Amino acid sequence: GTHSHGLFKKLGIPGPTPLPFLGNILSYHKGFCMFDMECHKKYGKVWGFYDGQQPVLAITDPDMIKTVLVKECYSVFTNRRPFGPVGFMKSAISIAEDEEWKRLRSLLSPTFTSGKLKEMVPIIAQYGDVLVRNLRREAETGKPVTLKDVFGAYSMDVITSTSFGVNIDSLNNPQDPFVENTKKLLDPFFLSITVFPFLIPILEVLNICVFPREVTNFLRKSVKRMKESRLEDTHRVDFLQLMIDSQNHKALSDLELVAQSIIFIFAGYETTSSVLSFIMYELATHPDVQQKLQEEIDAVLPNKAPPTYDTVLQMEYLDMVVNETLRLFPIAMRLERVCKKDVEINGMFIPKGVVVMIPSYALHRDPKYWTEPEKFLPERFSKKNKDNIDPYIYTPFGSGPRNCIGMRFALMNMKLALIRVLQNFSFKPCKETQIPLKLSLGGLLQPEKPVVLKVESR
Amino acid sequence: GTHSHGLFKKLGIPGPTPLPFLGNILSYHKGFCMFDMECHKKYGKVWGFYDGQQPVLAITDPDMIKTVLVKECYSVFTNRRPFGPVGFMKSAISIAEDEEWKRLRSLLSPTFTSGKLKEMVPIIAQYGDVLVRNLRREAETGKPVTLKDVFGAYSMDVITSTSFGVNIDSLNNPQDPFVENTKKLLDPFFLSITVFPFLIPILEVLNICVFPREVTNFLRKSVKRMKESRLEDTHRVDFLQLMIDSQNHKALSDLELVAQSIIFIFAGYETTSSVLSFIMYELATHPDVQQKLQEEIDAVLPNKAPPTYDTVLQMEYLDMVVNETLRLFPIAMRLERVCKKDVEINGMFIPKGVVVMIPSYALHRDPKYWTEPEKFLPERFSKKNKDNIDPYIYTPFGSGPRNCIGMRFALMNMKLALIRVLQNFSFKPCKETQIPLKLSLGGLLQPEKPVVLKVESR
Numbered sequence: 001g002t003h004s005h006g007l008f009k010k011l012g013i014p015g016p017t018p019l020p021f022l023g024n025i026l027s028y029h030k031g032f033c034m035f036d037m038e039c040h041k042k043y044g045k046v047w048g049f050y051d052g053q054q055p056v057l058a059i060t061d062p063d064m065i066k067t068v069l070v071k072e073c074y075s076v077f078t079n080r081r082p083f084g085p086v087g088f089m090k091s092a093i094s095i096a097e098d099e100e101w102k103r104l105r106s107l108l109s110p111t112f113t114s115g116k117l118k119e120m121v122p123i124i125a126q127y128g129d130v131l132v133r134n135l136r137r138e139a140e141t142g143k144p145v146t147l148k149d150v151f152g153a154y155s156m157d158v159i160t161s162t163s164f165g166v167n168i169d170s171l172n173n174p175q176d177p178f179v180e181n182t183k184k185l186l187d188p189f190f191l192s193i194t195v196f197p198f199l200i201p202i203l204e205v206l207n208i209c210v211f212p213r214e215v216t217n218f219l220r221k222s223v224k225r226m227k228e229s230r231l232e233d234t235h236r237v238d239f240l241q242l243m244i245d246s247q248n249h250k251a252l253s254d255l256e257l258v259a260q261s262i263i264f265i266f267a268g269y270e271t272t273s274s275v276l277s278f279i280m281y282e283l284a285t286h287p288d289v290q291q292k293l294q295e296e297i298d299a300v301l302p303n304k305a306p307p308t309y310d311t312v313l314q315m316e317y318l319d320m321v322v323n324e325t326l327r328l329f330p331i332a333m334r335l336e337r338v339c340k341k342d343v344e345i346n347g348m349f350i351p352k353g354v355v356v357m358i359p360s361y362a363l364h365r366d367p368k369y370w371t372e373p374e375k376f377l378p379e380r381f382s383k384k385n386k387d388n389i390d391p392y393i394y395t396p397f398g399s400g401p402r403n404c405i406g407m408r409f410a411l412m413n414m415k416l417a418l419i420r421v422l423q424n425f426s427f428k429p430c431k432e433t434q435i436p437l438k439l440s441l442g443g444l445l446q447p448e449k450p451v452v453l454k455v456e457s458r
Numbered sequence: 459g460t461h462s463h464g465l466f467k468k469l470g471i472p473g474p475t476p477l478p479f480l481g482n483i484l485s486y487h488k489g490f491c492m493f494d495m496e497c498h499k500k501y502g503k504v505w506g507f508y509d510g511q512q513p514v515l516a517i518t519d520p521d522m523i524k525t526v527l528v529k530e531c532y533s534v535f536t537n538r539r540p541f542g543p544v545g546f547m548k549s550a551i552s553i554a555e556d557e558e559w560k561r562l563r564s565l566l567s568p569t570f571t572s573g574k575l576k577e578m579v580p581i582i583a584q585y586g587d588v589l590v591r592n593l594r595r596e597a598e599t600g601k602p603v604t605l606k607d608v609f610g611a612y613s614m615d616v617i618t619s620t621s622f623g624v625n626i627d628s629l630n631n632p633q634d635p636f637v638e639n640t641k642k643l644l645d646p647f648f649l650s651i652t653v654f655p656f657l658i659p660i661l662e663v664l665n666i667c668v669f670p671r672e673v674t675n676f677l678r679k680s681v682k683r684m685k686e687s688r689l690e691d692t693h694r695v696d697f698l699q700l701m702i703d704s705q706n707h708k709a710l711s712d713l714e715l716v717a718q719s720i721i722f723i724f725a726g727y728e729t730t731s732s733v734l735s736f737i738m739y740e741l742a743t744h745p746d747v748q749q750k751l752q753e754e755i756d757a758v759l760p761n762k763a764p765p766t767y768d769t770v771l772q773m774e775y776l777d778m779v780v781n782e783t784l785r786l787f788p789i790a791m792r793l794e795r796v797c798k799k800d801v802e803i804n805g806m807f808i809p810k811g812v813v814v815m816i817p818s819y820a821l822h823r824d825p826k827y828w829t830e831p832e833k834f835l836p837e838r839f840s841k842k843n844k845d846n847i848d849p850y851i852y853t854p855f856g857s858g859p860r861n862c863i864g865m866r867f868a869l870m871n872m873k874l875a876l877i878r879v880l881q882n883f884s885f886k887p888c889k890e891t892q893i894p895l896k897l898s899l900g901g902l903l904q905p906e907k908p909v910v911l912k913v914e915s916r
């Protein structure tokens with residue numbers, strides 16, 4: 001019941017009073033983000049709460065965040081919180097722990113270099129043209145457009161060609177065997193898990209694998225079909241080939257190959273589609289920002305020139321818009337590390353087993369570091385003001401050795417979509433648009449209502 | 459079902475074919491020991507089997523046993539197999555893992571030194587006189603005596619005075635609050651656990667603590683009564699004081715104090731009582747050995763002189779009888795270590811998670827190292843033949859940093875009992891005696907029938 005619920009009281013750490021068994025999970029009715037901002041406002045820099053029987057310690061001090069994410073990563077704070085039923089996804093880089101994660105991290109790090117990203121921008125740019133082609137149709141209909149569907153179709157077209165080389169227009173091909181099996185996904189079982197963590201091993205013995213054995217065998221058989229058709233018949237630049245070439249520490253196995261590719265699919269579809277919808281909402285509700293970005297894009301790229309890797313990294317106002325949107329909407333919301341052993345960081349005793357949490361959403365809106373946090377102001381990230389941003393308060397991609405390994409890929413992917421879309425269209429709020437935007441009440445950072453806007457042709 | 463049952467087939471390791479879910483647990487119908495000897499005879503030096511879904515690898519090569527128990531103890535083979543419902547006994551030295559065990563081992567190692575054992579032999583010898591006093595009564599009745607009851611009463615009298623200083627004659631005091639609460643213990647739930655390991659965390663949330671909350675609070679309140687009555691009112695030589703003094707790495711906590719004392723109670727009652735019964739069986743069925751031991755005891759100790767610490771370690775034939783009995787009856791039966799990470803020891807790939815097992819019982823009776831293993835021959839351990847015994851085939855107390863920390867205490871305790879008993883009595887087989895002795899069919903090394911013998915007065 002209250003087995004470990006007296007931990008934070010024994011250490012003198014404040015926090016909301018936990019209920020037996022449940023802990024503080026009932027305080028999630030307002031959302032992960034609202035619960036973090038209220039605890040930050042009512043407890044100061046450090047507080048604690050319980051996800052069931054699991055004690056969670058939240059820290060907001062910049063030096064402690066640097067100590068947890070960077071200084072004591074390999075020694076104390078290496079792994080993340082486990083785990084609903086895992087299956088074979090234990091070999092996933094974002095799920096692996098300790099030395100197995102370090103092996104996968106070092107094996108997949110050369111894949112996400114800027115040199116390998118630069119070789120992927122011709123393929124990613126191809127579907128930017130496909131994106132505006134499906135947007136040209138939905139704009140000429142003369143009625144609001146749900147940005148979740150055109151960005152989700154674009155985000156999948158990028159992740160299928162970059163991870164496997166499969167080149168399909170998803171929006172106009174409702175069912176290419178590959179598209180549908182990738183669409184087979186995916187509350188309130190997640191809160192049941194956090195309050196019944198002892199029932200997780202039972203879902204392993206009942207062979208209740210979280211992923212359908214049909215799609216799993218598909219991707220596993222689709223990959224082995226690709227590995228066999230390419231060895232040898234008879235130069236490719238996808239994530240699969242970059243991992244196949246690395247197989248010739250110890251090399252990755254064939255099942256480990258499937259595990260990482262499933263990660264990138266989950267990593268690209270949810271995030272890039274949601275962040276692009278957040279950006280277009282801010283661009284539509286701030287037409288002055290949208291015009292200045294279009295004026296910059298027209299300058300570096302004359303007469304709608306095709307965006308390239310070097311021309312994307314030259315646009316400063318584009319990078320300022322992406323960073324300011326990621327401040328208001330950090331899709332990860334939280335950063336988490338498990339304390340492997342008893343440690344003393346910056347004057348605090350952190351006992352073993354406690355989950356250290358970085359409230360990234362609450363830090364991005366804390367009035368102590370941000371002037372008028374609720375407003376979309378891209379000028380915070382200009383070269384004049386960029387210096388005075390603490391890189392441990394603003395952590396949209398995390399920090400330390402276990403930060404987002406696909407940060408460069410995600411930034412390049414979203415910018416290539418924003419450029420081609422803004423070169424052809426302008427976006428204004430319609431009457432179905434939710435103004436102001438409300439966040440989802442669930443456990444995902446997504447708009448409560450799908451973003452609908454007007455789309456004109458330039 | 460057969461999730462990891464194909465592990466030993468992938469590594470080319472022989473072993474009995476496992477059944478789905480059950481594995482090889484049905485082969486335990488003949489006993490842990492018979493199953494190890496059959497697998498040793500039918501597979502050679504190395505084989506594998508499954509306790510449910512848990513793969514177990516047995517090794518019999520001396521160099522590999524030394525590598526697992528000594529060379530790669532801290533690095534690879536540090537912890538033992540876990541764990542039915544634990545409760546607060548996670549702080550037990552024999553259950554603790556990794557650095558927490560090393561902390562408890564170094565904190566309790568100075569307690570089991572020969573200097574501290576030498577200061578305990580006057581108190582242990584007091585109950586040797588109590589042992590012969592209760593044996594003088596049960597011998598004058600002129601009928602067979604169950605050695606389990608007089609040795610169990612003696613073994614408890616030693617463990618209560620050495621661990622807490624409580625001085626009570628257990629046999630004639632049926633219920634001293636302390637005696638009974640120590641007698642509140644304790645199949646087929648153990649095999650249910652090995653086949654349902656996922657149900658162990660459920661016994662933790664149901665507050666089904668394996669130890670009754672009544673006796674547990676008793677010992678916890680009995681210890682705090684002793685710690686408070688001794689601090690200060692107002693020189694003691696028990697295990698509790700040796701651990702109380704060590705509290706003034708990091709010092710042991712009050713709950714950690716109770717955990718280790720519970721270990722010593724379980725460690726002393728079952729073993730010393732059972733081994734003494736095994737010794738007296740061999741002494742009775744080999745009267746030539748019993749006479750030569752009594753002739754040696756009468757030499758060093760004239761006219762039944764009181765045995766002392768120095769006089770015990772002088773008796774060679776007494777040490778030869780104890781060692782030969784521990785060969786035929788190693789009460790631990792098996793030595794186990796968990797492989798923490800992928801390692802390559804002496805030409806073998808040991809994957810992570812595999813339990814490495816040392817069949818101590820089967821090694822002590824292997825005809826390759828022992829001539830006529832089934833016969834009780836103390837001359838194997840004479841100074842002439844003692845050199846040619848491999849210390850990794852004969853491992854009655856284990857080996858390496860995690861061997862039996864109470865080996866010296868157990869050897870001194872049993873010898874002090876054997877001396878005082880053999881100084882006064884002789885032992886012959888009666889008609890109720892099970893000849894030849896059969897081992898228990900269960901999961902404990904104890905006689906199938908309780909050892910009953912004739913007891914005469916000298």
Ligand code: HEM
Pocket residue numbers: 069093094095105263264267268271272275330331332335336395396397398399400401402403404405406407409410
């Ligand atoms: C807007 C897009 C994205 C954002 C904002 C984002 C953000 C994050 C954050 C905050 C973390 C956790 C960092 C930490 O715990 O310190 C993370 C982890 C990770 N991300 Fe991303 N991510 C994005 C897209 C992607 C993409 C497209 C990929 C791959 C194709 C990717 C791959 C990963 C991986 C593998 C990890 C775990 C790294 C590890 O455990 O070593 N992410 N991401």
Ligand code: HEM
Pocket residue numbers: 527551552553563721722725726729730733788789790793794853854855856857858859860861862863864865867868
């Ligand atoms: C005839 C009596 C005894 C025998 C044959 C015996 C044998 C053993 C064996 C074989 C092990 C495992 C070694 C390994 O895994 O390598 C062990 C462990 C242990 N024994 Fe004994 N034992 C006896 C009595 C005792 C007594 C009386 C005590 C304490 C009062 C004791 C305390 C321990 C402890 C604490 C461990 C675990 C050590 C650790 O995990 O670090 N034993 N014993």
